[PDB]
Design a protein around this nucleic acid. Structure first.
Ligand code: CA
Ligand code: CA
Ligand code: MN
Length: 103
DNA sequence: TATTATTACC
């Protein structure tokens, strides 16, 4: 993963499988996260997807985070604030939330 | 980065 290692990440999982949901539920806990929010969403195409943000307690490299989330996620370092992500990932009103946004 | 996709924060 080179030096691409962060605590704060965005992720998307398109067409989540049952196993994707299990990995996300098992990982998005206070053990691992200061704050996490994951919304179940559909865009204009109607493709169901998980829309997620993680503020992790420890740095993760992409390969490790990929494994933790089930292996099918698009990942990138977060550029907005925790609150920006809390609003964005809650916008379709079917979501899981762990912890509180960190300023 | 790793990865499935038009979804992806600022
Ligand atoms: Ca970080
Ligand atoms: Ca499955
Ligand atoms: Mn979305």
């Amino acid at each position: 993963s080179g030096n691409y290692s962060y605590k704060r990440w965005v992720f998307t999982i398109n067409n989540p499988t049952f196993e994707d949901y299990v990995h996300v539920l098992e990982f998005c806990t206070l053990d691992n996260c200061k704050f996490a929010i994951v919304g179940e969403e559909k865009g204009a195409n109607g493709t169901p997807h998980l829309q997620g943000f993680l503020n992790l307690r420890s740095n993760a490299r992409a390969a490790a985070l990929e494994e933790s989330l089930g292996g099918r996620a698009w990942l990138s370092r977060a550029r907005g604030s925790d609150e920006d992500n809390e609003e964005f990932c809650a916008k379709e009103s079917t979501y899981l939330r762990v912890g509180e946004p960190v300023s």
